[PDB]
């Protein structure tokens, strides 16, 4: 689906994931002591943690299994938690392939099932990349099963420019629209935020097309985007970012 070349920026993140899974997977011999299977991606939501996990899977040519912590939470649903790991081990043996269980919203597993999960982790020493928008909520005992913890931050200028270039590639822009200006004006927003902003501008012009019974939409202008930015605000708070920075600092 995707790989490191498709990902713009995030140097440090790529490096970390090279240390945690990619290198150890290509050359297990250079890691004789045995090396973590727990990986924790954390940061503000709509920042591409899933994309990152899938890319990692792609680079080591792994099996990818996505899991939502809110699906298995709904008790006897406890057994399925082991269902997944089982399937993973078995498939791994089967195809001569590493396996990756990706869990979104890991903090959701936090009363009985959580215990089995942690077991299944301990049975690891197949990788588990968990992802959380709320890492605090994770208690120390849980956080001990993930030794490698990676902070995926808000998109920077280069990335936001990449996102605008992607999302607008297929729609008509005014010849005066600078993708660079959009990137600057979007400091603080998320990847999802950018997607939604572009979708908004597009809808706006489509609504006009239908209303004025034109068979075509007018070019999206810079003012359209500015109006939208006046109304819509970062879906993540400046203080939440700090809350990430002090937790990462916390360890
Ligand atoms: Cl994210």
Ordered domains of the chain (ranges, CATH): 1-154 (3.40.50.300), 155-251 (1.10.8.60)
Cβ atoms 176, 221 nearer than 8 A: yes
- Element at 120 (helix H, strand E): helix 113-122
Query: In this structure, are residues 232 and 196 in contact, taking their beta carbons and an 8 Å threshold?
Result: yes
**Experimental method, per PDB record:** X-ray
Q: How far is the CA of 129 from the centre of ligand 1 (A)?
A: 13
CB within 8 A of 93, min separation 6: which ones? none
Calculate how far, in angstroms, residue 48's C-alpha sits from the geometric centre of ligand 1.
Answer: 5
- CA of 153 relative to ligand 1 center, distance in Å: 8
SS3 state at 130: strand
- Cα-to-centroid distance, 189 and ligand 1 (Å): 12
Strand 99-104 and strand 63-68: pairing?
A: parallel
CA dist 35 and 24 (Å) reads: 8
Enumerate residues 6+ apart whose C-beta is below 8 A from 203.
none
CA distance 138 to 132: 9
Spatial distance between the Cα atoms of 243 and 251, rounded to a whole number of angstroms = 13
Find the helix or strand (DSSP H, E) in which 104 lies. strand 99-104
| CA of 96 relative to ligand 1 center, distance in Å | 31
How much distance in Å is there from the Cα of 194 to the middle of ligand 1?
13
249: its two tokens: 């600092």
Please tell me what resolution, in angstroms, this structure has.
2.7
Nearest to 155 by CA among 137, 182, 130: 182
- 156 φ/ψ angles, rounded to the nearest 5 degrees: -90, -175
Q: What is the spatial distance between Cα 8 and Cα 30, in angstroms, rounded to a whole number?
A: 29
Rounded CA-CA distance 103/127 in Å is: 11
Q: How far apart are CA 237 and CA 251, in angstroms?
A: 22
Cα 223 to Cα 182: distance, rounded to the nearest angstrom: 11
How far, in whole angstroms, is CA 6 from its chain's centroid? Answer: 14
- Kind and range of the H or E element at 243? helix 238-250
Residue 199 CB partners (closer than 8 Å, separation 6+) = 167
């Amino acid at each position: 689906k995707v790989s490191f070349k498709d990902i713009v920026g995030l140097d440090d993140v790529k490096e970390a994931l090279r240390e945690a899974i990619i290198y150890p997977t290509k050359r297990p011999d250079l890691f004789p002591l045995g090396w973590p299977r727990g990986i924790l991606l954390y940061g503000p939501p709509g920042c591409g943690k899933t994309m990152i996990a899938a890319a990692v899977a792609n680079e080591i040519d792994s099996i990818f299994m996505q899991l939502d912590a809110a699906s298995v939470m709904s008790g006897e649903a406890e057994k399925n938690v082991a269902n997944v790991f089982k399937m993973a081990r078995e498939e791994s043996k089967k195809q001569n392939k590493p396996a990756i269980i990706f869990i979104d919203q890991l903090d959701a597993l936090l009363a009985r099932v959580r215990n089995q999960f942690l077991k299944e982790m301990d049975g690891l020493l197949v990788y588990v990349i968990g992802a959380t928008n709320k890492p605090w909520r994770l208690d120390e005992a849980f956080l001990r099963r993930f030794q490698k913890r990676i902070y995926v931050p808000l998109p920077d200028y280069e990335q936001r420019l990449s996102l605008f270039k992607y999302y607008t590639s297929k729609i008509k822009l005014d010849t005066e629209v600078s993708l660079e200006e959009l990137a600057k004006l979007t400091e603080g927003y998320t990847a999802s935020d950018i997607r939604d902003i572009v979708q908004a501008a597009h809808i706006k012009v489509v609504k006009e097309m239908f209303k004025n019974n034109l068979g075509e939409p007018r070019t999206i202008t810079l003012q359209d985007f500015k109006d939208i930015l006046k109304v819509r605000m970062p879906s993540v708070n400046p203080e939440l970012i700090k809350a990430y920075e002090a937790w990462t600092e916390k360890f």
